[PDB]
Design a protein around this ligand. Structure first.
Ligand SMILES: C[C@H](O)[C@H](O)C1=Nc2c(nc(N)[nH]c2=O)NC1
Ligand SMILES: [Cl-]
Ligand SMILES: [Fe+3]
Length: 274
């Protein structure tokens, strides 16, 4: 007998596709309380991100008109997202298998957990919810180079076979799409979704002496461990989304397969550090 997780409780009486894990967005299951939780999260993040989020993120939020006051209707959002970027969101019950995830990204589908966090649980979150996925991840698709990066990432994941590739690709996604920073002429800014949807990470990642801030390096990153239950110990910094995009992985998985991974707090001899 155990504490059910929120994914299980939210999805009772609900089905999902056996192959691709999608379902129609269950609009009737958001409460008044949920729409208030959404508005509170949205308003809080939008006061923190001036000076912090990269310009492209802020542009996406505006161009997509992500709702400020209610959990968005995914079909309505998709009208704008498809026209502007060629991508669509699909509702998923929560975390889905890695192979299923890659197949969606490879086909310009972004999986979004449909349910929302409960009020006393507005942060420290580990599992995605609809605020993290829709507010954190989706707006950055307005940058076509980042969108193409995500599609390419997915196609690479579909193709990956070598033992050890899945952790390597998870680390790459984590230190870019979830927790990446970008150097800009106006100063260091944020692009990672796990930062942008979090009050605490948004502040910490640009205002703390403890973590390392390391220039992006693909092979380094694929061989670096990460932690889920704490603030990050290293952030990787890109100079441009083109650098990310410009980054066949098959020989790379083999080069790194027997390698000892770097710890989440380590500095490697070839790193460039801030
Ligand atoms: C990307 C890496 O494989 C990571 O373990 C995954 N992230 C996600 C996932 N599933 C969902 N719904 N969202 C994610 O962000 N499964 C796979
Ligand atoms: Cl491979
Ligand atoms: Fe995420």
């Amino acid at each position: 007998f155990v504490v059910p997780d929120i994914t299980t409780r939210k999805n009772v009486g609900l089905s999902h596709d056996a192959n691709d894990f999608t379902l129609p967005q269950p609009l009737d299951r958001y409460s008044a309380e949920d729409h208030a939780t959404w508005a509170t999260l949205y308003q809080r993040q939008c006061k923190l991100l001036p000076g912090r989020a990269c310009d492209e993120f802020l542009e996406g939020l505006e161009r997509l008109e992500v709702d400020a006051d209610r959990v968005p209707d995914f079909n309505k959002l998709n009208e704008k997202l498809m026209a502007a970027t060629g991508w669509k969101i699909v509702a998923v019950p929560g975390l889905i298998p890695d192979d299923v995830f890659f197949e969606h990204l490879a086909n310009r589908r972004f999986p979004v957990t449909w349910w929302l966090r409960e009020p006393h649980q507005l942060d420290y979150l580990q599992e995605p919810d609809v605020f993290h996925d829709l507010f954190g991840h989706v707006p950055l698709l307005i940058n076509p180079v980042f969108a193409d990066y995500l599609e390419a990432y997915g196609k690479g994941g579909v193709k990956a076979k070598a033992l050890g590739a899945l952790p390597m690709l998870a680390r790459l996604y984590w230190y870019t799409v979830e927790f990446g920073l970008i150097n800009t002429p106006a100063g260091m800014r944020i692009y990672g979704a796990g930062i942008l949807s979090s009050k605490s990470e948004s502040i910490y990642c640009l205002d703390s002496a403890s973590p390392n801030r390391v220039g992006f390096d693909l092979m380094r990153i694929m061989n670096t461990r990460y932690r889920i239950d704490t603030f990050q110990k290293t952030y990787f910094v890109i100079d441009s989304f083109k650098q990310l995009f410009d980054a066949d992985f098959a020989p790379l998985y083999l080069q790194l397969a027997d390698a000892q991974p770097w710890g989440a707090g380590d500095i490697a001899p070839d790193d460039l550090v801030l």
